[PDB]
Design an enzyme around this catalytic site. Structure first.
Site, PDB file in Angstrom:
ATOM      1  CG  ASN A 165      75.162  75.721 -40.274  1.00 19.83           C
ATOM      2  OD1 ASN A 165      74.603  74.625 -40.146  1.00 19.83           O
ATOM      3  ND2 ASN A 165      74.626  76.860 -39.827  1.00 19.83           N
ATOM      4  CB  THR A 213      74.868  77.977 -32.579  1.00 15.54           C
ATOM      5  OG1 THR A 213      74.065  77.569 -33.699  1.00 15.54           O
ATOM      6  CG2 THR A 213      75.266  76.733 -31.791  1.00 15.54           C
ATOM      7  CG  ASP A 235      73.309  79.003 -37.533  1.00 16.79           C
ATOM      8  OD1 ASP A 235      72.593  78.092 -37.891  1.00 16.79           O
ATOM      9  OD2 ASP A 235      73.875  79.037 -36.393  1.00 16.79           O
ATOM     10  CG  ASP A 284      71.687  74.587 -43.490  1.00 14.24           C
ATOM     11  OD1 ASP A 284      71.437  74.003 -42.411  1.00 14.24           O
ATOM     12  OD2 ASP A 284      71.669  73.986 -44.591  1.00 14.24           O
ATOM     13  CE  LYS A 343      74.938  75.499 -36.255  1.00 15.63           C
ATOM     14  NZ  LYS A 343      73.911  75.410 -35.187  1.00 15.63           N
TER      15      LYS A 343
HETATM   16  O1  LIG Z   1      71.832  67.699 -44.742  1.00 14.83           O
HETATM   17  S1  LIG Z   1      72.927  68.618 -44.817  1.00 14.83           S
HETATM   18  O2  LIG Z   1      74.255  68.147 -44.576  1.00 14.83           O
HETATM   19  N1  LIG Z   1      72.628  69.808 -43.769  1.00 14.83           N
HETATM   20  C1  LIG Z   1      73.537  70.961 -43.651  1.00 14.83           C
HETATM   21  C2  LIG Z   1      74.582  70.833 -42.562  1.00 14.83           C
HETATM   22  N2  LIG Z   1      73.993  70.533 -41.253  1.00 14.83           N
HETATM   23  C3  LIG Z   1      73.216  71.647 -40.708  1.00 14.83           C
HETATM   24  C4  LIG Z   1      72.838  71.481 -39.255  1.00 14.83           C
HETATM   25  C5  LIG Z   1      71.759  70.650 -38.885  1.00 14.83           C
HETATM   26  C6  LIG Z   1      71.492  70.502 -37.515  1.00 14.83           C
HETATM   27  C7  LIG Z   1      72.245  71.155 -36.553  1.00 14.83           C
HETATM   28  C8  LIG Z   1      73.285  71.969 -36.929  1.00 14.83           C
HETATM   29  C9  LIG Z   1      73.579  72.135 -38.270  1.00 14.83           C
HETATM   30  C10 LIG Z   1      72.883  69.394 -46.408  1.00 14.83           C
HETATM   31  C11 LIG Z   1      72.151  70.547 -46.519  1.00 14.83           C
HETATM   32  C12 LIG Z   1      72.109  71.239 -47.721  1.00 14.83           C
HETATM   33  C13 LIG Z   1      72.811  70.794 -48.806  1.00 14.83           C
HETATM   34  C14 LIG Z   1      73.592  69.613 -48.731  1.00 14.83           C
HETATM   35  C15 LIG Z   1      74.394  69.140 -49.795  1.00 14.83           C
HETATM   36  N3  LIG Z   1      75.132  68.041 -49.740  1.00 14.83           N
HETATM   37  C16 LIG Z   1      75.111  67.339 -48.598  1.00 14.83           C
HETATM   38  C17 LIG Z   1      74.394  67.693 -47.492  1.00 14.83           C
HETATM   39  C18 LIG Z   1      73.617  68.873 -47.520  1.00 14.83           C
END
Ligand SMILES: O=S(=O)(NCCNCc1ccccc1)c1cccc2cnccc12
Lengths: 353, 18
Positions: free
Chosen positions: A174, A204, A169, A187, A171
């Site tokens: 991420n 994706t 995954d 993730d 991108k």
């Molecule tokens: O909530 S996130 O940004 N999510 C990860 C990035 N976004 C993933 C995503 C969500 C929806 C669609 C596509 C990608 C996140 C997750 C895990 C550890 C973290 C540590 N510090 C900040 C944020 C963190």
């Protein structure tokens, strides 16, 4: 040939040292994989500060640990929604992976626990936000800037693949940027242990390898295809294959045709043509010389791989950070409550968590 | 331009998995 004696000897020894490192890293991983940690904290140990992201079965909140004052990112998964949405195996697997890996560009899981309603994964807070936002905001990264990030994904995939883990995954959404400007992969919902082949349709649309689209058994080479997509998008500002609807994206992906902005260097186009190679017998990362075809490619000729690993290279870009707990690099969301039921939900399904 | 085509695709925002 292309290398004199000294450079060839140096490269050969470097490559042997990587093998030695990976062998030890695989031993450490398997120990932690076979004997995982569980229930290392509790909810009332943290103050909730802000929602950093939301999904269909949970959310991620910035929290502050009361005793130590440290900020963390706490992923809260609703057990009942996980089950309804058929994400049980993915959720347990993500936790098991995160507690077992160790690499400077993989997020560190510091605590995990559960209660009647939810599952909790407490990770280091990565305050720079997603690469996605910085990329859309800047427009595109210059080639040195993109190479800095690409080098970290190459090393991270070299690590994961040595553990037989396919990531699946990749991108910009991420990939988080830390306070030193380096990447954190957070993730692992779609990652799988795959020594040979696997078959699930996942990923994706813009980043799907052709053999996933064509419903083939596939292997770790899908990650190297996805790296080609990532490098392209970082350097162009848009991905190589896009359209209104996914089916039209997929026709482009499988066609074997790709077009490049005129500002792309010839070295970059040559690397991308070898990563975005529809034919698996010719894709870089999938040949006899493995990851070395990518690392020794001309476009990475200025990359000091050890210096990147040691985080001794000066990052091209350091995100704005006004202090610990700064959240300016994340989107804003409505703050919903964390209700915990009087009755244990889904205890059998999440026994190993 | 290719950039204009990208904007026209409607897929400039955050993309979720299939
Ligand atoms: O909530 S996130 O940004 N999510 C990860 C990035 N976004 C993933 C995503 C969500 C929806 C669609 C596509 C990608 C996140 C997750 C895990 C550890 C973290 C540590 N510090 C900040 C944020 C963190």
């Amino acid at each position: 040939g292309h290398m004199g004696n000294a450079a060839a000897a140096k490269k050969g020894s470097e490559q042997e040292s990587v093998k030695e490192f990976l062998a030890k890293a695989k031993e450490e991983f398997l120990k932690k994989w076979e004997s995982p940690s569980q229930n290392t904290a509790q909810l009332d140990h943290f103050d909730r500060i802000k929602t950093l992201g939301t999904g269909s079965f949970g959310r991620v909140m910035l929290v502050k640990h009361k005793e130590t004052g440290n900020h963390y990112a706490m992923k809260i998964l609703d057990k009942q929604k996980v089950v309804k949405l058929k994400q049980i195996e993915h959720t347990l697997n993500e936790k098991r992976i995160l507690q077992a890996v160790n690499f400077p560009f993989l997020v560190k899981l510091e605590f995990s626990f559960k209660d009647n309603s939810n599952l909790y994964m407490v990770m280091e807070y990565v305050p720079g936000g997603e690469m996605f936002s910085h990329l859309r905001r800047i427009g595109r990264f210059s080639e040195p800037h993109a190479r800095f990030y690409a080098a970290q994904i190459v090393l991270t995939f070299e690590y994961l693949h040595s553990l037989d883990l396919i990531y699946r995954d990749l991108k910009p959404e991420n990939l988080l940027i830390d306070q030193q400007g380096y990447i954190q992969v957070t993730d692992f919902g779609f990652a799988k242990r795959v020594k040979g082949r696997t078959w699930t349709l996942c990923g994706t649309p813009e980043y799907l390898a052709p053999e996933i689209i064509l419903s083939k058994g596939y292997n770790k080479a899908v990650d190297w295809w996805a790296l080609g997509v990532l490098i392209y998008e970082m350097a162009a500002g848009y991905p190589p294959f896009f359209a209104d609807q996914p089916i039209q994206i997929y026709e482009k992906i499988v066609s074997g045709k790709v077009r490049f902005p005129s500002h792309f260097s010839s070295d970059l186009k040559d690397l991308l043509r070898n990563l975005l190679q529809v034919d698996l017998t010719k894709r870089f990362g999938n040949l006899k010389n493995g990851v070395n075809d990518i690392k020794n490619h001309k476009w990475f000729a200025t990359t000091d791989w050890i210096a990147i690993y040691q985080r001794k290279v000066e990052a091209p870009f350091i995100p704005k950070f006004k202090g610990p707990g700064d959240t300016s690099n994340f989107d804003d969301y409505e703050e919903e409550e964390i209700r915990v039921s009087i009755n244990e939900k889904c205890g059998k399904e999440f026994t190993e968590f | 331009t290719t950039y204009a085509d990208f904007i026209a695709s409607g897929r400039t925002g955050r993309r979720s998995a299939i």
